[PDB]
Every structure is written in structure tokens, then in C-alpha cells.
């Protein structure tokens, strides 16, 4: 008993089976493309049952070369990926086939990439800060150990640079296991990450899964799940502290959109699939961390059209503990790494967790920046000289704070030439407290740009 | 540059005239074979001597 390709439309293939052998949903089917230049075994994932023993499947590899009526065999189980300590130090694709060493994981334990999230009874909120060394993140968007973190960004605002920096800061000294999931990102950045991890000897603790944007929608949908399955194995079957980097999670939903109309679904607002929220919720809730079992997840979320009101970013915002929101407006002002200090937020930025000093300093910084943002309209036309003396002082402090939130990051060395720098949390709090009280109003603002710390501030002030 | 362009134009025109005359000459040579070439092509399409 085997199927037969009836209708092919881009990445969506309809397959007819005998009435008694219709495969279940999310099963993996294998067709064959025999044309020499594109010959391959084509993995289809059953996405719908549409009656008369016809199923509709989303192809993982490109369907170019597929012929109507070609036999389609049923695996009887969903797409499965290798799991274990073996997958560490290796690169896989969405399907679980190894890239840097073909035929490597063919005999490891295999888990289906589809599973229900942990029971609500097993969820425990995380309230432990994760010190990054970045001033803006540590002060206004403090990350959570075991929680979920996001880098929201428009197109080309430095999401990949900042997530590579985050790998450099969190994963180097991490005693656990890392999993990086390239979900429709740029392949060049993936290769740079791979070589960087190999050079720093972090590769042996990291398993990479790539579904880069050259791949069709099916892989861009299932690569996130494939990497998350390794993350879940490490969380559950080994109790290891896990890091789970994903870049870019939006490519997941976007991929579903590309096949959304071919699957027969009426499009929702802004052309997205109606199941946007449900699919993203399943994937995101699989990433949570149960009690006594930690997955520190960090997801780069692309914001289409630089519009934070777009359905995908808006739906993703509810799934995150900390959200570093990168904006093109800040990036245009040279303030690398592009963080909007006002839009970004964190659930542990409460006085009961980060402390009274930290909370006061962060919230005064936010107050100053919001007031400066409101004043920008007045200054651009009426001029600063017509502002209040208090408002003028606040504007100077706000410019200095905006420029001090910039940092010379390790991953950005090839953007600035200068080497990276790390600012301890206490030093960040002290420096921004002083800035907010005006203890550095005498220094030129350019002295605060890309320095990373008070010693660097003094050195650059001397240089000016 | 103007002088170089002028001399290039002059040699281009001279070469154009010479090549046109020489092609008019080789036209007779081509016509000398046209018939045999056509016969060979007809035989090839038919699979037997024309």
C-alpha cells in the first residue's frame, strides 16, 4: 500500500492513498525525484486530510522534478530527528541529516519533532537574572535564566549581530548544552557562527540546526521544531541546563504563510495564515522550562515593515519574559546595538528581584529618555534654547544616556574595529545612576559613544 | 583621445569596406558548394542517397 502524487502546486503536494491506508497528520512520506540534476528523496509532511483518501502535504525539499503519479510511500511516523549527547558539536538540517559529516546520526535515538508542550502543572516561573555584560540589556531589559528572551527587530538592524554577541556572552562559560536553530536566516551568518564556535571550542557543547532561507517553506517550518526537539531531549532526558538560540523565529510563521493559501486556508489580516497564533503558540510553549529543568531560550523576532503592530510580532510578544526591541531609528543614530530603551521590557525588572537601586536607576533612565523623546519634536523646530533649564539639563543627560547605552560588542568588532568590552552589572548601575544625577554632565557626549564602562568613559574623555 | 577615436573610425571604415568586398568574393565560393550541401542534407534527412 503506497500513495500516488495527484496534484503538485509549488511546495504543496496532494497524494492519493488506498481508502484503508490514509496516513495520519504530520506523518512523513517519501517520494522520489528521478531527474538526474535534481534527483533526491523528497520528504512530504502530511498537513491535511481532504477526503476521498487524498492527503495534502508540505514538501521539505524543493518539489522541482516531481512527477504526477509518482509513488509516495508512508513512513508511519512523523519527521524524526536524532537526539543524545552525540548531536553536540555537529550541524544538522531540519530533517536531522548531518551536514558536516553525512550519515552521522543515522543510528542515534530518534524523536518525533511533534509533541505536546509540558503540562501546566510542570511550569514554574523563572525570576533569576542572567548577567550579560551589555549595559542596556542588564539595566533596562534584564534577561532571565531559564526564561524566554527575544530580540525584536526590523530588517537589517543587527539582530544576528546581537544574537551572536549573546552567544559569545552567555554560551562561552555556560556549563550546559547549547542548541542554535537557524530558522530561515542568512547562510553566511550561520557559517560565521559555526566557524566562530569552532574557534572558541564552544562547538563541542553546541548542536546547530539550520533551515536557512534558501530552503522551501516546509523546512523553514519544521527546523524550529527539529532544534527544539534536541533542546527538549536535553531538558528532559538529561536534566542539563540548556541554551536554545533561534534566529529567526518569524521565518517559522512566515513559512506557514507561504503555504497557507496553497493549503486552502482563507488569509487573515495582513495576509497571514489564520492559524498564526495557534501554530506559534504550540512552538513557543514547547520552549518553556519546566521546574527543575532549564531552557534559557533566546529568539530573534523579525518585525516586517519595521511595524511592531504587525500580527506576527504582536502575537510573539505574549510569549516572552524579556524583549530587547531593536529599532531602525536608534540604529540610524549610530547607537549600536540598536536597542529602543523605551519599547524593550523585562518581567524581572521589579524591585523585588533586581533590587531597589537597580530598579530606581533603570526607571529614572526610562523617565529621562521618554521626556527627551517627547521633547525631540519641540527641539527640532523651536530649538533647545527655548526649553526650560530643567528640561535642557534633562536633554543633555538624555543624550549622554542614549550614547552610553551603546556598547562596543565582541561580535561588532568588525563594525567598529575596536575590541569588545564587558560591563559588570554593578558598574552599569553605578554609571547610569551617576548619569541620571548629572555627575557626568561636564563631559562631551561623544565621550559616551561605544565605550562600555566608567574606565573607558574616563579614557575617552581624556582622549577628547 | 579624439585623434585615437578618429583613427579608429578610419580603420573601422577601411576594414568595413575590405570585409564587404571579401564577403562579396566568398559569396561565389559558398554558392559553388550550396548545391552539394543541399543534396547531402536531403540525403541525410531521407536516410538514403538523394
Amino acid at each position: 500500500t503506497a500513495g500516488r502524487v495527484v496534484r503538485i502546486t509549488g511546495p504543496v503536494v496532494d497524494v492519493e492513498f488506498p481508502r484503508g491506508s490514509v496516513p495520519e497528520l504530520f506523518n512523513a512520506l517519501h517520494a522520489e525525484i528521478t531527474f538526474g540534476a535534481l534527483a533526491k528523496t523528497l520528504t512530504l509532511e502530511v498537513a491535511q486530510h481532504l477526503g476521498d483518501s487524498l492527503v495534502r502535504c508540505i514538501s521539505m525539499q524543493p518539489t522541482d522534478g516531481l512527477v504526477r503519479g509518482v509513488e509516495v510511500t508512508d513512513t508511519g511516523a512523523s519527521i524524526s530527528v536524532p537526539v543524545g549527547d552525540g548531536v553536540k558539536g555537529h550541524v544538522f538540517n531540519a530533517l536531522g541529516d548531518c551536514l558536516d559529516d553525512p550519515g552521522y546520526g543515522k543510528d542515534f535515538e530518534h524523536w518525533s519533532i511533534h509533541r505536546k508542550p509540558p503540562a501546566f502543572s510542570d511550569l514554574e516561573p523563572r525570576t533569576e537574572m542572567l548577567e550579560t555584560g551589555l549595559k542596556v540589556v542588564d539595566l533596562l531589559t534584564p534577561y532571565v535564566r531559564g526564561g524566554k528572551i527575544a530580540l525584536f527587530g526590523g530588517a537589517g538592524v543587527g539582530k544576528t549581530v546581537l544574537i551572536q554577541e549573546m552567544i559569545n556572552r552567555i554560551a562561552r562559560n555556560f556549563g550546559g548544552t547549547s542548541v542554535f536553530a537557524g530558522v530561515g536566516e542568512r547562510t553566511r551568518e550561520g557559517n560565521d557562527l559555526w566557524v566562530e564556535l569552532a574557534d572558541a571550542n564552544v562547538l563541542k557543547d553546541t548542536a546547530l540546526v539550520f533551515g536557512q532561507m534558501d530552503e522551501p517553506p516546509g523546512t523553514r517550518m519544521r527546523v524550529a521544531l527539529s532544534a527544539l526537539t534536541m533542546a527538549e531531549f536535553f531538558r528532559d532526558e538529561q536534566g542539563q541546563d540548556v541554551l536554545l538560540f533561534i534566529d529567526n523565529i518569524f521565518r517559522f510563521t512566515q513559512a506557514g504563510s507561504e503555504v497557507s493559501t496553497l493549503l486552502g486556508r482563507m488569509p487573515s489580516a495582513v495576509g497571514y495564515q489564520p492559524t498564526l497564533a495557534d501554530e506559534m503558540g504550540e512552538l513557543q510553549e514547547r520552549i518553556t522550562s519546566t521546574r527543575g529543568r532549564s531552557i534559557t531560550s533566546m529568539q530573534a523576532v523579525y518585525v516586517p515593515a519595521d511595524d511592531y503592530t504587525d500580527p506576527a510580532p504582536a502575537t510573539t510578544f505574549a510569549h516572552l519574559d524579556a524583549t530587547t526591541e531593536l529599532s531602525r531609528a536608534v540604529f540610524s543614530k549610530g547607537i549600536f546595538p540598536a536597542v529602543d530603551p523605551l519599547a524593550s521590557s523585562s518581567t524581572i525588572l521589579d524591585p523585588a528581584i533586581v533590587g531597589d537601586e537597580h530598579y530606581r536607576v533603570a526607571q529614572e533612565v526610562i523617565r529621562i529618555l521618554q521626556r527627551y523623546k517627547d521633547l525631540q519634536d519641540i527641539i527640532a523646530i523651536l530649538g533647545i534654547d527655548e526649553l526650560s533649564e530643567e528640561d535642557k539639563q534633562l536633554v543633555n543627560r538624555a543624550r549622554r544616556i542614549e550614547r552610553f547605552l551603546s556598547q562596543n560588542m565582541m561580535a561588532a568588532e568588525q563594525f567598529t574595529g575596536q575590541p569588545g568590552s564587558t560591563v559588570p552589572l554593578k558598574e552599569t548601575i553605578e554609571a547610569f545612576d551617576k548619569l541620571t544625577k548629572g555627575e557626568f554632565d561636564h563631559l562631551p557626549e561623544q565621550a559616551f559613544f561605544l565605550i562600555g564602562g566608567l574606565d573607558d568613559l574616563a579614557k575617552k574623555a581624556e582622549s577628547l | 583621445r579624439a585623434q585615437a577615436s578618429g583613427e579608429v573610425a578610419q580603420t573601422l571604415t577601411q576594414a568595413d569596406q575590405q570585409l564587404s568586398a571579401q564577403g562579396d568574393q566568398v559569396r561565389s565560393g559558398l554558392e559553388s558548394s550550396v548545391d552539394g550541401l543541399s543534396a547531402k542534407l536531403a540525403s541525410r534527412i531521407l536516410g538514403v542517397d538523394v
Binding site: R7, I8, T9, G10, I33, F35, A37, L38, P62, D64, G65, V67, R68, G69, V91, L99, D100, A155, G156, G182, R186, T187, R188, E189, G190, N191, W194, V195, L208, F210, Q212, M213, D214, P216, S257, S260, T261, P267, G271, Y302, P304, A305, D306, R328, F331, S332, K333, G334, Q414, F415, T416, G417 | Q22, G29, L30, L37, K40, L41, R44, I45
Partner: protein, 393 residues
């Protein structure tokens, strides 16, 4: 001059053959606006080339139970119902080889410059997979564009994908043609490791504009090593959709033989429009802005094939300079942001700066090159390490 005039005809006649074989032929049942539905062809592959009787080619996009929805690649005025459609037996593919240097060609690879046929070394499928993560190496060899702003603030390296994005008449094609022209000094070296070959893909441009670009390249000597894959605005939506892929295939042939290529796509915005037209004519329900859901894929599938291959694969490279036309200076639109996220940098040419006297008109703040210093020589990196951020400030 030579006996080749008769020798070539003699060789063709002696070697000519039309040995019969099973053709597996279908029949048109519906045609119009560049789309034709073909009944039959049971064994047609997806994206297969179908031969219509007038020598016209189409690509089998849709493969339904009843018919095959193909996009006519060329003149569709000669396609009519009841007309007899042969399958080529080869997935969508184009001829490639060194013979394409200095030639203006259709997206199908056949010439349109009026000169002779192109002696293609072989045929490359337009949809071959891009180099994987383990097949690339970091972008480290600069591609000198000859423009101080780009080579200083937004350096373009070999293997990089730099987007030239901006409104009408902001200097985009000027930047790309200057980049192509600046490679003559490298071409004259005769060293494949230094030579940069070029493929200027013209999409939806009027013929006189492509002729102007070709004259600019000839007067600069760049047509000795530059190919033009011209899909003029007159050509159907199929050619305007296929031209970037044909250019990418021609470039990839050299890329995989250890040679460095530079690909200009002028404009990818006009490819998106052509793909929208093709998808709507095929009656795929559209997404946002009436574009197909695959419009992102369209560009990624293309741009992601521009890569710096590893030494094990020959060390070749292909640099992409996609060009995007923004409407009313809105870099935050759909296709602009898609390409910005698919590429390794931007050169956001603004009309405001262009009028203010800033030529080439790079908005320093928005523009960026994610390769950065790696795509600059050490002298330039030392002299201009912080130049872009300094100018933004």
C-alpha cells in the same frame, strides 16, 4: 578569409540527425496573457520546460489532476487552443559557459544582441540548491566598487550580498555600473583569483536603457568580462521573473569553477511585480500587497545562492548587488524589508541627499555592511574603522 564558411555547413549537414523518439506530447486547452494550460503530459516534471510549436518555451508551474499550468517564456501571441505541446524532458535550465561574456541574452540564455549563437559549455538548472553552511567560508576578499562612500562605510566583499535600495533616479544603476567598470583593472591581471566576472541582469528596463548600460560598459571596457541578462519591459512577465535566476545560473557556473562573479539585479522590485502577475494569472490567491506568499522565497532562493564557496569547492564566489526601488522613500515597505533581511547590507540612496549634493547619496545611518571590516584591506580598515558610525552621529 577562411574555409569555415562552407566548412561549418558541411559539418552540420554531415553530423545532423533527427532520430525519432517518443515525445510524450499534450495539447493546449487554455491560453492567454502568458499562461497556458496543457491537457496531457502525464510524466511532466514540476518546473519542466515545455516546447510549444512556434519554438516558444514555457515552464510547468502548476500540475493539477486535469491540466498543467505553464508560464509561456517568450511571445505568447502564437499560443492557441488545440495547439501541440512537447515536453523538453529537462527541468527549467539555461545554457552556461565562458561564451556568455560580452553577450546580451534572454532569460532563456538565447542571445538578443544580434550576434551569433552562444557556444554554451553545458546547461545548468535554474533551481539548484544554494551552498550549505558547511560549504561556505567567511567573506574576506574586498570587491572594490571604486566609490569612496561604499568602500569606506558599507564595504562590499566577494561573497557578500549588498542591497542598493532607493527611490527613482538616486544613483543605483550608476553605483552598480561603476562597480562593474572598476573591475577592469582586475580583469587585465589575467589571474582568476583577482578577475571578477560580472552579470548585469536587467529586469523591466526599457531596451534603450539596457543599450545605454551596454554602451557605458563598452566605453569602459567592461563588456570584455560582463554579461547582460536582459528581460526588457516588453518581454512577458515570465522573462522578468526568470531573468535573475538565469543570471544566477550563469554566475554560479563560474562560481563553482573557482572564479569570482558579481551579479547585479536591476530591479528585483520588477521581478516581484512579474512574479505577482504570473501568480495572479495562474490564479494563486495572493498575500499582502497582492503579492504571492512566496515572494520572500522568490528573492531568498535567488540571493542566498550568492556565496563564498569553501576551498574544498574551489574557493569561488558570487557577489550580489540587488537593486530595489522604494516608493516615496519608504524603506519600511514589504519587499524592501524582505530584501534587506535577505542581504548582508544596504546602500540606501536617498533623493534628498542626492539633491543636497551628496553623490552617490548613501544615507550613512540607514546604510550598513554586515561584513564590515572583513571586506576591507587593512589600510582601509585602519583609516575608516569608525567612519560610518561617526557620520551617523
Amino acid at each position: 578569409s577562411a574555409a569555415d564558411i562552407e566548412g561549418a555547413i558541411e559539418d552540420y549537414v554531415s553530423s545532423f540527425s533527427a532520430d525519432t523518439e517518443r515525445e510524450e506530447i499534450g495539447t493546449v486547452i487554455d491560453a492567454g496573457d502568458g499562461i497556458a494550460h496543457v491537457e496531457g503530459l502525464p510524466s511532466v516534471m514540476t518546473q519542466e520546460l515545455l516546447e510549444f510549436p512556434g519554438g516558444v518555451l514555457g515552464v510547468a508551474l502548476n500540475l493539477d489532476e486535469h491540466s498543467v499550468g505553464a508560464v509561456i517564456l517568450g511571445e505568447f501571441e502564437k499560443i492557441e487552443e488545440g495547439q501541440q505541446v512537447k515536453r523538453t524532458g529537462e527541468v527549467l535550465s539555461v545554457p552556461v559557459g565562458d561564451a556568455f561574456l560580452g553577450r546580451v541574452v534572454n532569460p532563456l540564455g538565447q542571445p538578443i544582441d544580434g550576434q551569433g549563437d552562444i557556444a554554451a559549455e553545458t546547461r545548468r538548472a535554474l533551481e539548484l540548491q544554494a551552498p550549505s553552511v558547511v560549504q561556505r567560508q567567511s567573506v574576506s576578499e574586498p570587491l572594490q566598487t571604486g566609490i569612496k562612500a561604499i568602500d569606506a562605510m558599507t564595504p562590499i566583499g566577494r561573497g557578500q550580498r549588498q542591497l542598493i535600495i532607493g527611490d527613482r533616479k538616486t544613483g543605483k544603476t550608476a553605483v552598480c555600473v561603476d562597480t562593474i567598470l572598476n573591475q577592469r583593472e582586475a580583469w587585465l591581471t589575467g589571474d582568476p583569483k583577482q578577475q571578477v566576472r560580472c552579470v548585469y541582469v536587467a529586469i523591466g528596463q526599457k531596451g534603450t536603457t539596457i543599450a545605454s548600460v551596454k554602451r557605458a560598459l563598452e566605453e569602459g571596457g567592461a563588456m570584455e568580462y560582463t554579461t547582460i541578462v536582459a528581460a526588457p519591459a516588453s518581454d512577458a512577465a515570465g522573462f522578468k521573473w526568470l531573468a535573475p535566476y538565469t543570471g544566477s545560473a550563469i554566475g554560479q557556473h563560474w562560481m563553482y569553477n573557482g572564479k569570482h562573479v558579481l551579479i547585479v539585479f536591476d530591479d528585483l522590485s520588477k521581478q516581484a511585480d512579474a512574479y505577482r502577475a504570473i501568480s495572479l494569472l495562474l490564479r494563486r490567491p495572493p498575500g499582502r500587497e497582492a503579492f504571492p506568499g512566496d515572494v520572500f522565497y522568490l528573492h531568498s532562493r535567488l540571493l542566498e545562492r550568492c556565496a563564498k564557496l569553501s576551498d574544498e569547492l574551489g574557493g569561488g564566489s558570487m557577489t550580489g548587488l540587488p537593486i530595489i526601488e522604494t516608493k516615496a522613500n519608504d524603506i519600511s515597505a514589504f519587499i524592501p524589508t524582505n530584501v534587506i533581511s535577505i542581504t548582508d547590507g544596504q546602500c540606501f540612496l536617498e533623493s534628498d541627499l542626492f539633491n543636497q549634493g551628496v553623490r552617490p547619496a548613501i544615507n550613512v545611518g540607514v546604510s550598513v555592511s554586515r561584513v564590515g571590516g572583513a571586506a576591507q584591506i587593512k589600510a582601509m580598515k585602519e583609516v575608516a574603522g569608525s567612519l560610518r558610525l561617526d557620520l551617523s552621529q
